[PDB]
Design a protein around this ligand. Structure first.
Ligand SMILES: CC(=O)N[C@H]1[C@H](O[C@H]2[C@@H](O)[C@@H](CO)O[C@@H](O[C@H]3[C@H](O)[C@@H](O)[C@@H](O)O[C@@H]3CO)[C@@H]2O)O[C@H](CO)[C@@H](O[C@@H]2O[C@H](CO)[C@H](O)[C@H](O)[C@H]2O)[C@@H]1O
Ligand SMILES: [Cl-]
Ligand SMILES: [Cl-]
Ligand SMILES: [Cl-]
Ligand SMILES: [Cl-]
Length: 139
């Protein structure tokens, strides 16, 4: 059934290459933001943040937060989300990157800045979505 947002998905023993995380939900009408935050304690190893209205443009911001400071943003203008519509986000952990696909299309890759993959042990999901499912498997 419905999951409550913000939602915290534990990743027992951290992430590993070949782990595939799948998030299903629906963007609310008039959404502003979505965020997936892969955490290593207080640090955010990988923040994946679609913004629906940043100076009247849609953009995806990726970043990492270390010791309560945000780093250098990486931005992607390809924006596969739409207000009101169902989505699937898949994050595949690879040896050197997270790889993100939305609705079965490749979107972006994010190079690992936090290198202790085994300590990335929680995924926070938040923002203007109805969350249907969040799960992981090994491929
Ligand atoms: C104000 C806000 O949105 N705070 C949330 C925080 O947002 C920051 C994050 O998106 C970073 C990524 O680089 O950018 C920051 O904005 C930048 C901006 O992009 C730059 O152009 C320039 O202007 O500098 C600013 C400041 O660096 C955003 O402020 O993102 C975190 C993580 O998702 C949010 O935290 C969570 O909110 C959830 C809501 O339910 C939940 O509480 C969760 O537990 C929180 O960790 C901040 O709220
Ligand atoms: Cl953690
Ligand atoms: Cl939209
Ligand atoms: Cl890789
Ligand atoms: Cl590290």
């Amino acid at each position: 059934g419905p999951l409550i947002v913000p939602y915290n998905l534990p990743l027992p023993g951290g992430v590993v290459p070949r782990m595939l995380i799948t998030i299903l939900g629906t963007v609310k009408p008039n959404a502003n933001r979505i965020a997936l935050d892969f955490q290593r304690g207080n640090d955010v190893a990988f923040h994946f943040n679609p913004r629906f209205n940043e100076n009247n443009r849609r953009v995806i911001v990726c970043n990492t937060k270390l010791d309560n400071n945000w780093g250098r943003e990486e931005r992607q203008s390809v924006f596969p989300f739409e207000s009101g519509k169902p989505f699937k986000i898949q994050v595949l952990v690879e040896p050197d990157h997270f790889k993100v696909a939305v609705n079965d299309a490749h979107l972006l890759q994010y190079n690992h800045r936090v290198k202790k993959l085994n300590e990335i042990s929680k995924l926070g999901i938040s923002g203007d979505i109805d969350l249907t499912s969040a799960s992981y498997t090994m491929i």
